[model samples]
Structures are given as structure tokens and as C-alpha cells.
Target: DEFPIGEDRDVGPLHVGGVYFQPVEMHPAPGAQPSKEEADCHIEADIHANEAGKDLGYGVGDFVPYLRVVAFLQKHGSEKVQKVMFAPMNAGDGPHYGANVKFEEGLGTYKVRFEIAAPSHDEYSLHIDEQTGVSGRFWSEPLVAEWDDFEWKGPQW
Candidate 1:
């Protein structure tokens, strides 16, 4: 795991498809370029590829690459905050996929949904030649995760 800055809630050590996903919610996320504004919430798609992921062209303990992550933040009363896209980033925490989002609604109970998918062929280049070809395949479809009832707030930088 990359060295984290500031305080954050570690959503899960959830394992799916040979990877461990730890979605982090960071307040005043440290080292963001221009830094995080007081109203921004930084969500990091912290993932670690395990040994089982090796066949899928990953190295153990490596950050999974070529991923496309989309998340939806919904306030308790059915209000949609934003459809945020998590992008690859570098910070005090090193390299990870994440997004900085601000909820105008401010403090509230909320639900978050993440839709994760492998990179498209255009974004991921793989050799098809028998000698250099990758032996495995990416996930066939997007993976979904829904986490609810987060008492949300934070950021002062």
C-alpha cells in the first residue's frame, strides 16, 4: 500500500478477481496538485494485485493498471452528488487511482457505488503473437460495489 497522508476511512480489504481493493476516503488529501480544497473529498481506488493475479498479467503486490473506475455518490435522500471518474494519480501516497470530488450538499449520510472495468483494447496494448502474447484475459464486464450509510464530511487544504 502507498504511504497515505492525512486521515481516511479504509472501506475494505475486499478481494475480487485476484485483487485486493481498499477504497479510501481522505479528508484534505495530502499532496494533491494545487492540493485539495476544503470542500473536496478524495477517493482512492487502492488496489493490490495478488499472486493469483499473475496470470492476468499482474505482479504480486503491484497496483493494477489500465483500470477504469466510475463512482456515484448519492446523499441519503436520493440526491445524486456526482458521477465521478477515478483517475490514475501520484501524490505523497505514490501512484494510485483516485478522484477529488466536492459535495455541495455538505455533511450528510450517503451511499456510494463504484463501477470498475478493465481498460479497453485501445488503452491497453497487449501482444497477440504466441511468444509475446499475454496468457490471460481481463474481466469480461464491469464490477460493481455499493457502500452505503457513510457519514460524510471533511477537507481543509
Candidate 2:
């Protein structure tokens, strides 16, 4: 019988830390009228708890674990931001995770890429550890929230 090797290299036990969330804005020329501002979420995550925290290139028929990405919008008692989870889009079959990706310094970052043709479409991408789930960024639409103010009085005796 044949058994698997290096199964512990999976990024299953990775934890999130120090999320550098930034809302990007696009600006035109100095005198040019600026277009509507759009908020984009960017994150720098770190992964911890890897039994073997070393580089080990994956081979054919290897397993890549799933990772979760979450964001918080509307600070101080505001609406909740939905959690977005993503995984290695392309694994095995001679595909390196997803398209439009670059790996260096033990980290991978995916730039602007087209979304899957479907309803409610938006362009997004991700940057994640090809080895462990320690750090990953799910680039997508900025979570927008609206607030309303109202005053009220209660009767007292």
C-alpha cells in the first residue's frame, strides 16, 4: 500500500494577524474633475501554526487547503461586513492557483483580474500563501454601509 507524504504541510492551522485594510481611491490630473470615489479593500495577512514552516514545492496530486477572508465595515456599532472565503482557484493540472498572480518573498499577490461571467459581476483577485493559509487577501468590492439619524423622546411621570 502507498501512503501520502508531507501531509502536515497543509495550511489548515493558519491564523490571521495584523490585517492592513486600506480603502484605495483613484484620482485623475490635478485640475481634472475627479470621478466618483470607490473604496477597495486590501489586506496583509500572516499565518501561524505550521508544523513544518519551510518551503516545499508542491508536486502533482497534492492537496491545497481552503482559506477564509473577512472584512469589517461601518465602525462603532455599524452593520456587519459579510465574510468572504476563497481557495486556490487553480491547483494541479499544471495550473498555479488563479490567473494574474505573482509569487515572491514567500508571498503571492494577485492584481486586477476579470471575474467569472455571471450575474452581480465585479472584478477581483487574491494574494495568498501557496504553502500555508497564514496570509491571504481577497480583493473585491468595498463593503459599503449607510447610516440614518433620528431623534425620539419618551414620556415620564
Candidate 3:
């Protein structure tokens, strides 16, 4: 199959809730295998949001925002994907929310667990890595509020 198996490609334009995610960087596993069925081919990539600056609100309010990252992995050259994994971290400050990781065959995607503390000018990073036999892994950046406020808009219909 003509998969960008080992190249750094951009994949995104994903919108969740009130936050927007930019094109995530995807790097397919190194080397190739006899078949895509084998997990020997692994993949790694970075997922982040567009909320680098501007106030989206903090604490509890309609303005307060949350982010969820989902990764989809294709099984062989088939249009169907088989595995998924989520990021582990909280974007928020309070203990109200925490990070989690799991697999859901129904969803066919990995739901990244995270919570954002107070809203501030900040940038967050989420990393994903996958290997054969072993399930995928996720990592997240610490939340740091230090941005200026501005008019914010959710994804346009």
C-alpha cells in the first residue's frame, strides 16, 4: 500500500467542544513489515490545540473550555482502523478532572484524558507512540496560563 509509513505528515482540522485543534503532526512507524496486519510497524505523532493565547475563561463558566484528543490508527491498507490510545494528563488546575487512557473498539479512536486549570495564555502538547504487541502510549504538556484575553469563537458550523 502507498502509506506515508515513515514520513512526517499533518493531520487535523479537528474541533471538539469550544476548543479547536490544529493539524496534528503524524510520523508513521520506522521500517516496513511483510503486512500491515503485523504491529511491527509503529507510529508516533504530536497533537495540540490552537489556544496559544487569548482568554477563554477559567474555573466554571460557559467560557471555560476543555480539550479532548482522539487518535485513529489504520489496520493494514484497509479503510478500517483497529487500535487506539489516549493521552494521559489534565489541562486544568483543580482536581475536578484528571488524565486517563483506554481503548474502545466501538469508537475506534483513543480518547485523550486531560483538564485545563485556569485559562491563561499557554500552549499544550500531546504525544502518542505505538508499537507491536504493546498498546499505544500518550504524553501531555503541563498547563500554563499566561496569555492575553480576546474575543473567542467556537468552531463555525
Clashes of each: 0, 2, 12
Q: Which has the better TM-score: candidate 1, or candidate 3?
A: 1
The residue-by-residue lDDT of candidate 3 on 64-140, one tens digit each, is 23443233433222355333333323232221111111212322222222223322335532233343222321224
TM-score ranking of the models: 1, 2, 3
lDDT-sorted candidate list, best first: 1, 3, 2
**Model 3, global lDDT:** 0.25
Model 1 per-residue lDDT tens digits across residues 50-130: 665666666767777677877777889865566767777676657766776666566787677677787797888656578
> Which ranges of candidate 1 are over 4 A from the true structure?
1-35, 79-81, 127-135, 155-157
Task: List all candidate RMSDs to the true structure.
Answer: 7.0, 19.1, 18.6
Q: For candidate 1, what's the RMSD?
A: 7.0
Question: In candidate 3, what residue range of length 10 has the lowest lDDT sum?
Answer: 95-104
Top candidate by lDDT: 1
* Alpha-carbon TM-score of each model against the true structure: 0.66, 0.24, 0.23
